[PDB]
RNA sequence: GGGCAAAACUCAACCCUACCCCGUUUUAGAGCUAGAAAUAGCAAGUUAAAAUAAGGCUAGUCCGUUAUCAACUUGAAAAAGUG
DNA sequence: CAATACCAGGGGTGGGTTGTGTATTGCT
DNA sequence: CCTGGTATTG
């Protein structure tokens, strides 16, 4: 017979269905294997495979990087110790041993328990002298005396082990370190530019004001308030704001045209500033330079909170200041508490559980938690004003190793280390000879372009070696072929040209590439004037003239410039009409202008002889971000430029890559013409062919060479092909499961390929939205965050999120919005919900009243646009509002929405265009249709139809085949069945639609695509449609409105649906990552081989990879008498390899004896067992079970629950709304009935006596509640019966905690069921037959 | 119209390298006084070492948490096969 | 033995890719 | 968050 397949692909489920030409679901007798008495079973050909979500490779990669980092840090310490080996041997022959075994307890220590000095007196004396490591570091930096080699090692090792970040390149340039010295020089330069309006900085304490621990805006205010007649938005105020790290706008200071927002931290900044400089010149260059220097000094004084006069170890001195102030403040706080709150001293200083000082030090309290706990204690006390201020500045009782130490650059640690080396090399000759080695150990970092230093056993590595010896930081340049390794980095990184697959893609900012884009756009530009009959192309001379006169003198070329600056000036046209370009030219020559500003040699740029050198320069600037490598590759061109241009160029940086190779653009030439693609793009007579026309023109060579070039390589497997698809790994796991389901379904139907396969794909935090708001107000320069504090979780509500996105302003009315009145306010859809279902914040907007939007059918009225356009663009620059949202807000000025707009919105709602769905369709099509005809065209025996969820959702809502997701998992299978039905019927009714729905090769649309699915309806908003629905041409019947609806209903009401939870071996981390303290418990796992957890603590809570059923004997009692057992042993992920290498030895080491090797059953997670009365359990672990049954609630109750709970929308037909409400009230008794159907189920399968009794009491409690709320809570009640892991749920206000199945003893005598992917093929094993 | 390409603006999803900072764990940093002793009173507290998936062989300044997996007949395996 | 309350490593820096809609020029 | 491990508690 003939049949079709319906599929619903999700992130966790693949629903599948088989239908006949009558839209019926077949049933079949399937053979049952095993050792049970049942040999076959009847099954319906509907079901749904369920699985756990597929995970990305991000967490694995981060674990891998942390692993490599720990390894290499240990290697750094090893290098330092090998350097110190021979002399430390003379000083202390067991020092490094004591350091290595510092973790062991004294019982296991092979040496003295005191690490540094091997005796208690010297150790205690050391600690008294240096309370922290930073004391010793500063001392070794400053003191002139010879020091103990062990203390030198400790200081250098602490500097190398925690060496600081690498965000700053080169040396730190410590001549401009003082904030006052740079602020005074900034005042000098500013007064230089303005002799008439100077600023007197006398008595201005810039050090205290600018280095204070306050917000940047507050420090700006405090500095400006010290300058009378000067304001914060003046030029000097904006310069100070730029130095503090803010985003000033210099547009108003220089009477500019548009925004000149600067910020030193943005990567664009350089360009930005130089852009700005073009407006006013180079007089202000060194002014902004002085501002940047002042900013660097402030960034340093943020870290080096100590003056640099007395010491050369400012970091260690700042740490010592922390320690001393902590000591003073702690002494004072204890004295104060003894004075006024001696009742609370012990809780504060002895209680670790409380967030006092004790928990802050010994417990688990954090600095923030400690501040919150002790702030009211300080406020209630007297004499704590200084301590209170210190708390508010986040600077009280501070430790030295804190979270904010991440801003410390490595050059600071390097300065202190180099100072110690200089001091102590006068006494230790090996320190003098190895100074640069020890410095290298701190500075050297494996380059980003080299990767893992592997030797042929790493799938991540790509490095090649000049010689075959061990790589150290010192011999790196001699062992590693940096040239070939960087070349391989390039090859691994860059995409290939698709037309020429053996050629690399040009950089996105290549001069040749932007020339290509400009000429390709400019070629298809036509123009017309009065004395012209027809618009004409530009000639080659015209195009070269427009390039030389406009594209090489202005970064952007506007149509206005094209008309006035070219056609008026050269062609003498008073008027002209341009076509092919609107507003401005998308393409431009930005790289040309960059290199023009840098090299200052327009002739050098315009010489065809310099094409190769400039291309290589741009390539080098795009490949790398490393200063060393960039400097290295531009040395061949060092003779052509001076040092100033060379430095400017070294700073020039680019990212991104094009999509075409250079051999395609200006390499291959037409055989006849001898011209390249770019040659035609510059001049093609009057034809003016562009890139597409140039590679698709049979008249010229290119197409032939392209076809000669392309190669279809060695084909991927199915799994490989799916993996290489663009998309999330979850949906790709779903796709692979879909293909396997389809394979097995074809196998079930006697290997007969179906006629149709309908596929549907489901379309489907706090920190990122808080980040949006945080950056948005920062850019806006507003203070609403200051006025209204809000936590990240509070943004679960969408109204508050929209509010803080809108800066207190109303989006349709220029009026402030009230925080406390947020209840009344209205969330409106920019493009309305009637036309588009976009419930995202992108089509959402918070306003005082919906009315103020203007009319509803169109986009907000032109008046509202004219009003709020500036505020909308300001929110767009702050990125609080996206460009899509902005364009939708202002569409009225462009005419609102056209008829084509609405028609296309509908068509996109109905036709799927998502690429991943097309890829799945391609895979299924290429697997089903494999033969060719006499014309060698593909034989499409199977048709792959693709649907969007709105079709079947609307079908359910129209004909009341409602879905309730929380009842069971049948809705996936039902979605698949309805997909098959609707797709098949739709393409039967309208074959012309195949173009839109099958894979392979005025206002009319608004009515057509909105009425395509009306042939199911009997009545219409007039004419009654025929009860029988046929194809107009073939006459074949497509839909019987008297029977096929009944068929769909009978199919949806079927209780037997093949729901299969995919059994899976667990993978990932061995256990919880927490390192637990020591404890007397055999659940603790040692973190090292010899670290007994009873002494050293360790891990617990491992993940079971899979359980194993063991039938064996164990020793019982002192006599060790063998007693027979049959139990579940969970093999952990960590034990899995050793178990699989030899299971017998593994089990015997566990204590089992005489193991029946052939009765060992591997049981992954979710293994299915059946017990009595059809009760089913799934394996959640070796010692816990999940619910294994589905509640097949009758369709009547599903529809009643949908309607009574107001599950989605109300029908919108007032008569029909009253119809449905009357049905709900007439069938109210269903409530009780539903409960009964649950109770019975729970009594037969769930077996939670206490939970069921509490649920029944709760249901009887709220019997006078409205029907809608009782139904909405009955919807929750299905958590008790849902398949899978138990969960807690609320019925009204009563909470029902999950009942767990903490024992797997019963499944050992149950029936184990092995199901195929559809669950149609089974193997049933009676486990009670094993053991004895 | 369906598929496709490049440019412009855009946001979502993914893949990879080199590093940084905390956290946790054990040990070290002589607790004192009064008691037989339980215990009570006070003193102190900020730091470091070392581990940071057990570990593996290929012994690399490498690898170790992604993807893939019902059962059965083969095969050592990858694979094929069975209702 | 089974019921049950508690708990689960976090933050930052670089690069590359496909796909998303909007609209320009085009191929097929 | 979800859901399985874990110690408490009878
Ligand atoms: K991390
Ligand atoms: K010992
Ligand atoms: K002032
Ligand atoms: K703490
Ligand atoms: K444009
Ligand atoms: K770069
Ligand atoms: K896995
Ligand atoms: K997993
Ligand atoms: K299975
Ligand atoms: K893109
Ligand atoms: Mg390790
Ligand atoms: Mg630490």
CSV table of C-alpha atoms in Angstrom, one decimal, chain A residues 603-974:
chain,number,residue,atom,x,y,z
A,603,UNK,CA,51.1,58.5,-5.5
A,604,UNK,CA,52.4,55.4,-3.7
A,605,UNK,CA,48.9,54.1,-3.3
A,606,UNK,CA,47.9,54.8,-6.9
A,607,UNK,CA,50.9,52.9,-8.4
A,608,UNK,CA,50.0,49.5,-9.8
A,609,UNK,CA,53.5,48.5,-9.0
A,610,UNK,CA,52.7,48.7,-5.2
A,611,UNK,CA,49.7,46.5,-5.5
A,612,UNK,CA,51.5,43.4,-4.1
A,613,UNK,CA,53.3,45.1,-1.3
A,614,UNK,CA,50.1,46.8,0.0
A,615,UNK,CA,48.2,43.6,-0.3
A,616,UNK,CA,50.8,41.8,1.8
A,617,UNK,CA,50.8,44.6,4.3
A,618,UNK,CA,47.0,44.4,4.7
A,619,UNK,CA,47.3,40.6,5.0
A,620,UNK,CA,49.9,40.8,7.7
A,621,UNK,CA,47.8,43.4,9.6
A,622,UNK,CA,44.7,41.2,9.4
A,623,UNK,CA,46.3,37.8,10.3
A,624,UNK,CA,47.9,38.9,13.6
A,625,UNK,CA,47.3,41.0,16.6
A,626,UNK,CA,50.8,40.5,18.0
A,627,UNK,CA,53.2,43.5,17.8
A,628,UNK,CA,56.3,41.3,17.4
A,629,UNK,CA,54.9,39.4,14.4
A,630,UNK,CA,53.6,42.5,12.7
A,631,UNK,CA,57.0,44.2,13.1
A,632,UNK,CA,58.7,41.0,11.8
A,633,UNK,CA,56.7,40.7,8.6
A,634,UNK,CA,56.9,44.4,7.6
A,635,UNK,CA,60.7,44.5,7.7
A,636,UNK,CA,61.0,43.6,4.0
A,637,UNK,CA,59.2,46.9,3.4
A,638,UNK,CA,61.1,48.9,6.0
A,639,UNK,CA,63.3,50.5,3.3
A,640,UNK,CA,60.2,52.2,1.6
A,641,UNK,CA,59.0,54.1,4.7
A,642,UNK,CA,60.4,56.1,7.5
A,643,UNK,CA,60.1,55.3,11.2
A,644,UNK,CA,57.2,57.5,12.0
A,645,UNK,CA,55.0,56.0,9.2
A,646,UNK,CA,56.3,52.6,10.3
A,647,UNK,CA,55.1,53.1,13.8
A,648,UNK,CA,51.7,54.5,12.7
A,649,UNK,CA,51.4,51.4,10.4
A,650,UNK,CA,52.3,48.9,13.1
A,651,UNK,CA,49.4,50.4,15.1
A,652,UNK,CA,47.1,49.9,12.2
A,653,UNK,CA,44.9,46.8,12.8
A,654,UNK,CA,42.2,45.0,10.8
A,655,UNK,CA,39.8,42.1,11.4
A,656,UNK,CA,37.5,40.2,9.1
A,657,UNK,CA,37.8,38.4,5.7
A,658,UNK,CA,36.1,38.8,2.4
A,659,UNK,CA,34.4,36.0,0.4
A,660,UNK,CA,36.5,35.9,-2.8
A,661,UNK,CA,40.1,35.1,-3.6
A,662,UNK,CA,42.5,37.4,-5.3
A,663,UNK,CA,43.0,35.0,-8.3
A,664,UNK,CA,39.2,35.4,-8.9
A,665,UNK,CA,39.2,39.2,-8.6
A,666,UNK,CA,42.3,40.1,-10.5
A,667,UNK,CA,44.1,36.8,-11.3
A,668,UNK,CA,42.4,34.6,-13.9
A,669,UNK,CA,41.7,36.3,-17.2
A,670,UNK,CA,39.4,35.7,-20.1
A,671,UNK,CA,41.2,33.8,-22.7
A,672,UNK,CA,40.0,35.9,-25.6
A,673,UNK,CA,39.9,39.4,-23.9
A,674,UNK,CA,43.0,38.8,-21.7
A,675,UNK,CA,41.1,40.8,-19.0
A,676,UNK,CA,40.5,40.0,-15.4
A,677,UNK,CA,37.2,40.3,-13.5
A,678,UNK,CA,38.3,43.6,-12.2
A,679,UNK,CA,39.4,44.7,-15.7
A,680,UNK,CA,35.8,44.1,-16.9
A,681,UNK,CA,34.4,45.8,-13.8
A,682,UNK,CA,36.4,48.9,-14.7
A,683,UNK,CA,35.6,48.8,-18.4
A,684,UNK,CA,33.2,46.6,-20.3
A,685,UNK,CA,32.4,48.8,-23.3
A,686,UNK,CA,28.7,49.6,-23.0
A,687,UNK,CA,27.7,46.2,-21.6
A,688,UNK,CA,28.9,46.9,-18.1
A,689,UNK,CA,28.7,43.3,-16.8
A,690,UNK,CA,29.0,42.7,-13.1
A,691,UNK,CA,30.5,39.8,-11.1
A,692,UNK,CA,27.5,37.5,-11.4
A,693,UNK,CA,27.1,38.2,-15.1
A,694,UNK,CA,30.9,37.9,-15.6
A,695,UNK,CA,31.1,34.3,-14.2
A,696,UNK,CA,27.8,33.2,-15.8
A,697,UNK,CA,28.4,34.5,-19.3
A,698,UNK,CA,28.9,31.6,-21.8
A,699,UNK,CA,30.5,34.1,-24.1
A,700,UNK,CA,33.6,34.5,-22.0
A,701,UNK,CA,36.1,32.2,-20.4
A,702,UNK,CA,35.5,32.5,-16.6
A,703,UNK,CA,32.7,30.0,-16.2
A,704,UNK,CA,34.8,27.3,-17.9
A,705,UNK,CA,37.8,27.8,-15.7
A,706,UNK,CA,35.5,27.9,-12.6
A,707,UNK,CA,34.0,24.6,-13.5
A,708,UNK,CA,37.5,23.3,-14.3
A,709,UNK,CA,38.6,24.4,-10.8
A,710,UNK,CA,35.8,23.1,-8.4
A,711,UNK,CA,36.1,19.7,-6.9
A,712,UNK,CA,33.6,17.7,-4.9
A,713,UNK,CA,35.8,16.0,-2.4
A,714,UNK,CA,35.5,12.7,-0.5
A,715,UNK,CA,31.9,12.6,0.7
A,716,UNK,CA,31.1,12.9,4.4
A,717,UNK,CA,29.1,10.3,6.2
A,718,UNK,CA,25.6,11.0,7.4
A,719,UNK,CA,26.9,11.9,10.9
A,720,UNK,CA,29.8,13.9,9.5
A,721,UNK,CA,27.5,15.8,7.1
A,722,UNK,CA,25.1,16.6,10.0
A,723,UNK,CA,27.9,17.7,12.2
A,724,UNK,CA,29.3,20.1,9.6
A,725,UNK,CA,25.8,21.8,9.3
A,726,UNK,CA,25.4,25.3,10.7
A,727,UNK,CA,23.2,25.1,13.8
A,728,UNK,CA,23.1,24.3,17.4
A,729,UNK,CA,24.2,20.8,18.5
A,730,UNK,CA,20.8,20.2,20.1
A,731,UNK,CA,18.9,20.6,16.9
A,732,UNK,CA,21.5,18.6,15.0
A,733,UNK,CA,21.2,15.7,17.4
A,734,UNK,CA,17.4,16.0,16.7
A,735,UNK,CA,18.1,15.9,13.0
A,736,UNK,CA,20.2,12.7,13.2
A,737,UNK,CA,17.6,11.0,15.3
A,738,UNK,CA,15.0,12.1,12.7
A,739,UNK,CA,17.0,10.4,9.9
A,740,UNK,CA,17.3,7.2,12.0
A,741,UNK,CA,13.6,7.2,12.7
A,742,UNK,CA,12.8,7.5,9.0
A,743,UNK,CA,15.2,4.7,8.2
A,744,UNK,CA,13.5,2.3,10.6
A,745,UNK,CA,10.0,3.4,9.5
A,746,UNK,CA,11.0,2.5,5.9
A,747,UNK,CA,12.3,-0.8,7.2
A,748,UNK,CA,8.9,-1.4,8.9
A,749,UNK,CA,6.8,-0.8,5.7
A,750,UNK,CA,8.5,-3.6,3.9
A,751,UNK,CA,11.3,-1.3,2.5
A,752,UNK,CA,8.7,0.6,0.5
A,753,UNK,CA,9.6,4.3,0.3
A,754,UNK,CA,6.8,6.6,1.3
A,755,UNK,CA,5.0,9.0,-1.1
A,756,UNK,CA,5.4,12.1,1.2
A,757,UNK,CA,7.5,13.1,4.1
A,758,UNK,CA,6.2,16.2,5.9
A,759,UNK,CA,8.8,17.7,8.3
A,760,UNK,CA,8.2,20.4,10.9
A,761,UNK,CA,10.8,22.1,13.1
A,762,UNK,CA,10.2,24.0,16.4
A,763,UNK,CA,11.4,27.5,16.2
A,764,UNK,CA,12.9,27.4,19.7
A,765,UNK,CA,19.9,35.6,30.5
A,766,UNK,CA,19.7,38.0,33.5
A,767,UNK,CA,23.3,39.0,33.2
A,768,UNK,CA,23.2,39.9,29.5
A,769,UNK,CA,20.1,42.1,29.8
A,770,UNK,CA,21.6,43.8,32.8
A,771,UNK,CA,24.7,44.3,30.7
A,772,UNK,CA,22.5,45.8,27.9
A,773,UNK,CA,21.0,48.3,30.5
A,774,UNK,CA,24.4,49.0,32.1
A,775,UNK,CA,26.1,49.8,28.8
A,776,UNK,CA,23.1,51.7,27.6
A,777,UNK,CA,22.9,54.2,30.4
A,778,UNK,CA,26.7,54.5,30.4
A,779,UNK,CA,26.4,55.6,26.7
A,780,UNK,CA,23.4,57.8,27.4
A,781,UNK,CA,25.3,59.5,30.2
A,782,UNK,CA,22.2,59.2,32.4
A,783,UNK,CA,21.8,58.7,36.1
A,784,UNK,CA,18.6,56.6,36.4
A,785,UNK,CA,20.6,53.7,37.8
A,786,UNK,CA,21.8,56.1,40.5
A,787,UNK,CA,18.3,57.2,41.2
A,788,UNK,CA,16.6,53.7,41.0
A,789,UNK,CA,18.6,50.6,42.1
A,790,UNK,CA,17.6,47.3,40.5
A,791,UNK,CA,18.9,43.8,40.8
A,792,UNK,CA,19.5,41.5,37.8
A,793,UNK,CA,16.8,39.0,38.8
A,794,UNK,CA,14.2,41.8,39.1
A,795,UNK,CA,14.3,41.9,35.3
A,796,UNK,CA,12.3,38.7,35.0
A,797,UNK,CA,9.4,41.1,34.6
A,798,UNK,CA,9.2,42.5,31.1
A,799,UNK,CA,7.6,45.9,32.1
A,800,UNK,CA,10.5,46.8,34.4
A,801,UNK,CA,13.0,45.7,31.8
A,802,UNK,CA,11.3,47.8,29.1
A,803,UNK,CA,11.2,50.8,31.6
A,804,UNK,CA,14.9,50.8,32.5
A,805,UNK,CA,15.5,50.3,28.7
A,806,UNK,CA,13.5,53.5,28.1
A,807,UNK,CA,15.3,55.7,30.7
A,808,UNK,CA,12.1,56.5,32.6
A,809,UNK,CA,10.8,58.0,29.4
A,810,UNK,CA,7.6,57.0,27.6
A,811,UNK,CA,8.3,55.8,24.0
A,812,UNK,CA,5.3,57.5,22.4
A,813,UNK,CA,5.1,60.6,24.8
A,814,UNK,CA,8.0,62.8,25.9
A,815,UNK,CA,7.1,62.4,29.5
A,816,UNK,CA,8.8,60.7,32.5
A,817,UNK,CA,7.2,57.4,33.6
A,818,UNK,CA,6.5,56.5,37.3
A,819,UNK,CA,8.2,53.5,38.8
A,820,UNK,CA,5.4,52.8,41.4
A,821,UNK,CA,2.7,53.3,38.8
A,822,UNK,CA,4.1,50.5,36.6
A,823,UNK,CA,1.0,48.5,37.2
A,824,UNK,CA,-1.3,50.7,35.0
A,825,UNK,CA,1.1,51.1,32.2
A,826,UNK,CA,0.8,49.4,28.8
A,827,UNK,CA,3.2,47.1,26.8
A,828,UNK,CA,2.3,47.8,23.1
A,829,UNK,CA,3.6,46.1,20.0
A,830,UNK,CA,5.3,48.4,17.7
A,831,UNK,CA,4.2,46.5,14.6
A,832,UNK,CA,0.8,45.2,16.0
A,833,UNK,CA,0.0,41.7,17.1
A,834,UNK,CA,-2.9,41.4,14.7
A,835,UNK,CA,-0.5,41.6,11.7
A,836,UNK,CA,2.6,40.0,13.2
A,837,UNK,CA,3.1,37.7,16.2
A,838,UNK,CA,6.3,39.2,17.6
A,839,UNK,CA,6.0,39.0,21.4
A,840,UNK,CA,9.8,39.7,21.7
A,841,UNK,CA,11.0,42.9,23.4
A,842,UNK,CA,12.2,43.9,19.9
A,843,UNK,CA,8.6,44.4,18.9
A,844,UNK,CA,7.6,45.5,22.4
A,845,UNK,CA,7.4,49.0,23.9
A,846,UNK,CA,6.4,50.4,27.3
A,847,UNK,CA,4.1,53.4,27.2
A,848,UNK,CA,1.7,55.2,29.5
A,849,UNK,CA,-1.3,54.3,27.4
A,850,UNK,CA,-1.8,52.3,24.2
A,851,UNK,CA,-4.0,55.2,22.8
A,852,UNK,CA,-1.0,57.5,22.5
A,853,UNK,CA,0.5,55.3,19.8
A,854,UNK,CA,-2.0,56.7,17.3
A,855,UNK,CA,-3.9,54.3,15.0
A,856,UNK,CA,-3.5,50.6,15.5
A,857,UNK,CA,-3.7,49.0,12.1
A,858,UNK,CA,-0.7,50.8,10.7
A,859,UNK,CA,2.7,51.5,12.3
A,860,UNK,CA,2.7,54.5,14.8
A,861,UNK,CA,1.4,57.7,13.3
A,862,UNK,CA,3.8,60.1,11.5
A,863,UNK,CA,3.2,62.6,14.3
A,864,UNK,CA,4.7,60.3,17.0
A,865,UNK,CA,7.7,59.7,14.7
A,866,UNK,CA,8.3,63.4,14.2
A,867,UNK,CA,8.1,63.7,18.0
A,868,UNK,CA,10.2,60.8,19.3
A,869,UNK,CA,12.7,60.2,16.4
A,870,UNK,CA,15.7,61.9,18.2
A,871,UNK,CA,15.0,60.0,21.5
A,872,UNK,CA,14.7,56.8,19.5
A,873,UNK,CA,18.1,57.4,17.8
A,874,UNK,CA,19.6,58.2,21.2
A,875,UNK,CA,18.3,54.8,22.5
A,876,UNK,CA,19.7,53.2,19.3
A,877,UNK,CA,23.2,54.6,19.9
A,878,UNK,CA,23.1,53.3,23.5
A,879,UNK,CA,22.1,49.9,22.0
A,880,UNK,CA,19.1,49.8,24.3
A,881,UNK,CA,17.0,49.7,21.1
A,882,UNK,CA,18.0,47.6,18.1
A,883,UNK,CA,18.1,48.8,14.5
A,884,UNK,CA,15.2,46.5,13.6
A,885,UNK,CA,13.2,48.0,16.5
A,886,UNK,CA,14.2,51.5,15.5
A,887,UNK,CA,13.3,51.0,11.8
A,888,UNK,CA,9.9,49.6,12.8
A,889,UNK,CA,9.3,52.6,15.1
A,890,UNK,CA,10.0,55.1,12.3
A,891,UNK,CA,8.4,53.3,9.4
A,892,UNK,CA,5.5,55.8,9.1
A,893,UNK,CA,7.8,58.5,7.7
A,894,UNK,CA,8.5,55.9,5.0
A,895,UNK,CA,4.8,55.4,4.4
A,896,UNK,CA,3.9,52.9,7.1
A,897,UNK,CA,3.4,49.4,5.7
A,898,UNK,CA,2.5,48.7,2.1
A,899,UNK,CA,0.1,46.0,0.8
A,900,UNK,CA,3.2,43.9,-0.2
A,901,UNK,CA,4.4,44.2,3.4
A,902,UNK,CA,1.3,42.6,4.9
A,903,UNK,CA,1.0,40.0,2.2
A,904,UNK,CA,4.7,39.0,2.7
A,905,UNK,CA,4.2,38.9,6.5
A,906,UNK,CA,1.5,36.3,6.0
A,907,UNK,CA,3.5,34.4,3.4
A,908,UNK,CA,6.5,34.2,5.8
A,909,UNK,CA,4.2,33.0,8.6
A,910,UNK,CA,3.2,30.1,6.3
A,911,UNK,CA,6.3,29.2,4.3
A,912,UNK,CA,9.5,28.0,6.0
A,913,UNK,CA,12.7,29.7,4.9
A,914,UNK,CA,15.0,28.7,7.8
A,915,UNK,CA,18.2,27.2,6.3
A,916,UNK,CA,18.5,24.3,8.8
A,917,UNK,CA,15.1,23.0,7.7
A,918,UNK,CA,16.2,23.2,4.0
A,919,UNK,CA,19.3,21.2,5.0
A,920,UNK,CA,17.2,18.5,6.6
A,921,UNK,CA,14.9,18.4,3.6
A,922,UNK,CA,18.0,18.0,1.4
A,923,UNK,CA,19.3,15.1,3.5
A,924,UNK,CA,16.0,13.3,3.4
A,925,UNK,CA,15.5,13.9,-0.3
A,926,UNK,CA,19.0,12.8,-1.3
A,927,UNK,CA,18.5,9.6,0.8
A,928,UNK,CA,15.0,8.7,-0.6
A,929,UNK,CA,15.4,9.7,-4.3
A,930,UNK,CA,18.6,8.1,-5.6
A,931,UNK,CA,17.7,7.2,-9.3
A,932,UNK,CA,17.8,9.1,-12.6
A,933,UNK,CA,15.7,8.9,-15.7
A,934,UNK,CA,16.5,8.9,-19.4
A,935,UNK,CA,17.3,12.7,-19.2
A,936,UNK,CA,19.5,12.0,-16.1
A,937,UNK,CA,17.3,14.2,-14.0
A,938,UNK,CA,16.5,13.1,-10.4
A,939,UNK,CA,13.5,10.8,-9.9
A,940,UNK,CA,11.5,12.4,-7.1
A,941,UNK,CA,9.6,9.3,-6.0
A,942,UNK,CA,9.4,10.8,-2.4
A,943,UNK,CA,8.3,14.4,-1.9
A,944,UNK,CA,9.8,16.2,1.1
A,945,UNK,CA,7.2,18.8,2.3
A,946,UNK,CA,8.2,21.4,4.9
A,947,UNK,CA,5.8,23.1,7.2
A,948,UNK,CA,5.8,25.8,9.9
A,949,UNK,CA,4.2,25.2,13.2
A,950,UNK,CA,1.6,27.9,12.7
A,951,UNK,CA,-0.3,25.8,10.1
A,952,UNK,CA,-0.9,22.8,12.4
A,953,UNK,CA,-1.4,25.1,15.4
A,954,UNK,CA,-4.1,27.0,13.5
A,955,UNK,CA,-5.6,23.7,12.4
A,956,UNK,CA,-5.9,22.5,16.0
A,957,UNK,CA,-7.4,25.9,17.1
A,958,UNK,CA,-9.9,25.9,14.2
A,959,UNK,CA,-11.2,22.4,14.5
A,960,UNK,CA,-10.7,22.0,18.3
A,961,UNK,CA,-8.0,19.3,18.2
A,962,UNK,CA,-6.4,21.2,21.0
A,963,UNK,CA,-3.0,20.4,22.6
A,964,UNK,CA,-2.1,20.6,26.3
A,965,UNK,CA,1.6,20.0,26.8
A,966,UNK,CA,1.6,19.2,30.5
A,967,UNK,CA,-0.8,16.2,30.2
A,968,UNK,CA,1.7,13.7,28.6
A,969,UNK,CA,4.2,13.4,25.8
A,970,UNK,CA,1.7,12.3,23.1
A,971,UNK,CA,1.4,15.8,21.7
A,972,UNK,CA,4.7,15.4,19.8
A,973,UNK,CA,3.4,12.3,18.0
A,974,UNK,CA,0.1,14.1,17.4
